[PDB]
């Protein structure tokens, strides 16, 4: 769980780290792995598009099955891996017919638990269903936005979508942002909340932790020159200006939802 590190040195003075015994001490399952090169924020023209990205550890991509395309066949959970790509611990589930696949581990999940997908299975935590067999007032995760797309919403550690309503073909979800939305009822969704719920309680202690996380330093606006950033210059920390991004658009308040062909699904905007 959440433990505080004894302050022998400053980098160990402020660290609060999340130890967990259930994670499999061992090398991961190999055929579900593939290589995953880090980008540094650089597109095919080589330029930085997103700043503050690069460095850190080298890490390998665990192919995780979000689709749950296997149906009607039971499966049991072998062990729990720690995935570097995401915030939730993943589970290596083993089916009865002989297949091993990585899934997103929910909150209530231990090794040996039983999981079945399909339109049939049950309402236990772990089971994939359409959103026509999951009751109103429920609590789901790994929600599809398109039927067969794979699973988009509620995928971070500890997030959960409360199914609010059903008007005919449509299911009104209350998302985790506070946005309300209509989704298609035939889309798949897994029950429960995603695990690793204490992920928000780590505080990283020192600069090197965010550095080997994969994050570069972030330089303020008032430090830079008036060529580099619009909050440039001054004789000792003048600001005087409405806050903007480096590309002119005024930050800190301006709304830029600019989609206009998906507003039919939004019941309520975030408040």
Partner 1 sequence: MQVILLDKVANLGSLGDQVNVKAGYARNFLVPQGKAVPATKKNIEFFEARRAELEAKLAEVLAAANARAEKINALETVTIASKAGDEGKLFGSIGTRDIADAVTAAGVEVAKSEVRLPNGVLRTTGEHEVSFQVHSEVFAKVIVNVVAE
Partner RNA sequence: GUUUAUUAAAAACACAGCACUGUGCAAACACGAAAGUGGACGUAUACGGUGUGACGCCUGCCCGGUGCCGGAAGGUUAAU
Burial letters 128-155, b for 16+ CB under 10 A, else e = bbbbeebeeebebbbbbbeeeeebebbb
Total residues contacting partner 1 (rule CB under 8 A)? 3
Smallest gap, in angstroms, from Cβ of residue 168 to partner 1?
9
Strand order of the β-sheet with 140-141 is 128-130, 188-191, 140-141
120 binds, among partner 1, RNA, none (CB under 5 to 8 A by kind): partner 1
Q: How far is the CB of 130 from partner 1 (least distance, A)?
A: 10
Q: What is the gyration radius of the CA atoms in the chain, in angstroms?
A: 22
* Phi/psi of residue 239, nearest 5 degrees: -115, -65
Q: Tell me the closest approach of the beta carbon of residue 132 to partner 1, in angstroms.
A: 8
Whole-number Å distance between alpha carbons of 236 and 227: 17
265 binds, among RNA, partner 1, none (CB under 5 to 8 A by kind): RNA
260 makes contact, choosing from RNA, partner 1, none, with CB < 5 to 8 Å by partner type, with none
Which residue's CB is nearer to partner 1, number 46 or number 168? 168
Residues 132 to 161 in contact with partner 1, rule: CB under 8 A: 133
Can you list the positions of beta strands (E) in the chain?
2-4, 16-18, 33-34, 61-62, 74-81, 90-95, 100-104, 114-116, 128-130, 140-141, 162-167, 170-174, 180-184, 188-191
Question: Considering only CA atoms, which of 66, 98, 102 is closest in space to residue 81?
Answer: 102
If the CB atoms of residues 116 and 190 are measured against RNA, the closer one turns out to be 190
Taking CB within 5 to 8 Å according to partner kind, which of RNA, partner 1, none is near residue 133? partner 1
198 binds partner 1 (CB under 8 A): no
CB of 72 to RNA, least distance (A): 25
Among 16, 23, 48, 119, binds partner 1 (CB under 8 A): 119
Residues making contact with partner 1 (CB under 8 A): 119-120, 133
């Amino acid at each position: 769980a959440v433990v505080k590190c004894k302050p022998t040195s400053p980098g160990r003075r402020h660290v609060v780290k999340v130890v967990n015994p259930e994670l499999h001490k061992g090398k991961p399952f190999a055929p579900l792995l593939e290589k995953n090169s880090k980008s540094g924020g650089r597109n095919n023209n080589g330029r930085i598009t997103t700043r503050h990205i690069g460095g850190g550890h080298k890490q390998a991509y665990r192919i995780v099955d979000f689709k749950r395309n296997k149906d009607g066949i039971p499966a049991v959970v072998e062990r729990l891996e720690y995935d570097p790509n995401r915030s939730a611990n993943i589970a290596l589930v083993l089916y009865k017919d002989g297949e091993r696949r990585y899934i997103l581990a929910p909150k209530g999940l231990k090794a040996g638990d039983q999981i079945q997908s399909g339109v049939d299975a049950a309402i236990k935590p772990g089971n994939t269903l359409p959103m026509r067999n999951i009751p109103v007032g429920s609590t789901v995760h790994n929600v599809e936005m398109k039927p067969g797309k794979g699973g988009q919403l509620a995928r971070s550690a500890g997030t959960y979508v409360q199914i609010v309503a059903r008007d005919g073909a449509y299911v009104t979800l209350r998302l985790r942002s506070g946005e309300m939305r209509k989704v298609e009822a035939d889309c798949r969704a897994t029950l429960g909340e995603v695990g690793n719920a204490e992920h928000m309680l780590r505080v990283l202690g020192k600069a090197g932790a965010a550095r080997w996380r994969g994050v570069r330093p972030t330089v303020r606006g008032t430090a830079m020159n008036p060529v580099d950033h619009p909050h440039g210059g001054g004789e000792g920390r003048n600001f005087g200006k409405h806050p903007v991004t480096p590309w002119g658009v005024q930050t800190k308040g301006k709304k830029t939802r600019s989609n206009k062909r998906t507003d039919k699904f939004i019941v309520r905007r975030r408040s």
